């Protein structure tokens, strides 16, 4: 099961809402920005959140 | 030349790191050659015991562990340098054994 957990899906939306201008399609850029804008200790969770906010940024401009 | 050998053994990793850092910070303050803390192998005590207090049911086992860590610190002979180490506050779970090798 690849299903993204509910809580990372939740936490992704408010980043996009609060600082839409600070995130791009670059995975590593979003990774640093969510690393600093949050208090995540788990690197795996950091990467998950980055990989989903990247898709959110992608969907923002596709429609 | 005379060398003083310090063995620091403890279950808690962070306490071991704290004591090692304290010795290190004492070292260059005293200006004496202090060979860096070499982390020796960590000894792993393992005990496997049946969970069931009685004999009935499936046979299941529980494996309990202790990881005891150990670091080695070699420092050079300066009475001022080796005077400042009994004054170190040492946590309970950390044990330090200091010997003197020629």
């Amino acid at each position: 099961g690849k299903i993204r957990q509910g809580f990372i899906k939740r936490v992704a939306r408010e980043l996009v809402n609060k600082y839409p201008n600070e995130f791009t399609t670059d995975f590593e850029h979003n990774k640093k920005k969510v690393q600093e804008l949050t208090n995540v200790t788990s690197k795996k969770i950091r990467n998950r959140i980055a990989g989903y906010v990247t898709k959110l940024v992608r969907m923002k401009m596709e429609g | 030349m005379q060398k003083a050998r310090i063995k620091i053994a403890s279950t808690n990793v962070r306490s071991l790191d704290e004591v090692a850092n304290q010795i290190k910070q004492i070292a260059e303050r005293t200006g004496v050659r202090m060979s860096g803390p070499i982390p020796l192998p960590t000894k792993r005590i393992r005990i496997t015991t049946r969970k069931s207090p009685d004999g009935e049911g499936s046979a299941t086992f529980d494996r309990w562990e202790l990881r005891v860590h150990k670091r080695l610190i070699d420092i050079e002979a300066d009475e001022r340098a080796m005077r400042q180490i009994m004054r170190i506050r040492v946590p309970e779970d950390v044990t330090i054994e200091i010997e003197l090798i020629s």
């Binding site: 980043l15 788990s42 | 044990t95």
Partner: protein, 195 residues
């Protein structure tokens, strides 16, 4: 053999803990700590009522000061007694308190609910209390009162939730009391705070 030494010290330590809990049952004993110096072994005892531990004119503690040196061979046992900063945050203290309360004939629901409400009113995040055995009949039952947020599995449950087990004695038999407390100061793995 360092290995033969460390766990021997631990053996002495929780043997002392068991014996002291057997002795300090009325004192609301909380916990122990042992620190060695060349001067002697210094024992640090946290209890819900250090006044009871001191007893009367130090008569209690002095007696104990003998036994530690006698039964367990402790060199110069220097005993100190202190109060836990929040007994409602210690699972063991509340468990023993509740077991003693049930030993006084209080209806289990009333006492358990008062204790749970008091613990929550002390700032607790999650409180579970399980009472098992003869409560309202010959046949034993298990009854659970839970309140708040309380993780029950995974490492966070093991690393953060404090457990306390006690037994309450009564004419019909023994009631087993289990208490789990979730201190508010802890944070869950998935609890992310934005800025």
């Amino acid at each position: 053999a360092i290995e033969r030494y460390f766990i021997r010290e631990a053996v002495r330590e929780m043997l002392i803990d068991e014996f002291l809990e057997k002795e300090l049952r009325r004192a609301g004993y909380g916990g122990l700590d042992i620190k060695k110096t060349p001067l002697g072994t210094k024992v640090i005892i946290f209890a819900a009522n250090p006044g009871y531990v001191i007893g009367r004119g130090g008569r209690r503690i002095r007696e104990l000061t003998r036994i530690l040196e006698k039964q367990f061979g402790l060199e110069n046992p220097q005993i100190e007694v202190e109060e836990i900063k929040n007994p409602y945050l210690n699972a063991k203290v509340q468990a023993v308190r509740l077991a003693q309360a049930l030993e006084r004939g209080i209806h289990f629901r009333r006492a358990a609910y008062a204790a749970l409400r008091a613990i929550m009113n002390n700032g607790a995040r999650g409180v579970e209390i399980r009472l098992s055995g003869k409560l309202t009949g010959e046949r034993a039952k298990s009854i659970r009162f839970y309140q708040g947020y309380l993780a029950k599995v995974g490492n966070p449950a093991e690393t953060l939730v404090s457990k306390g087990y006690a037994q309450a004695l009564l004419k019909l038999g023994v009631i087993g009391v289990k208490v789990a407390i979730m201190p508010p100061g802890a944070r869950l793995p998935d609890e992310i705070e934005i800025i």
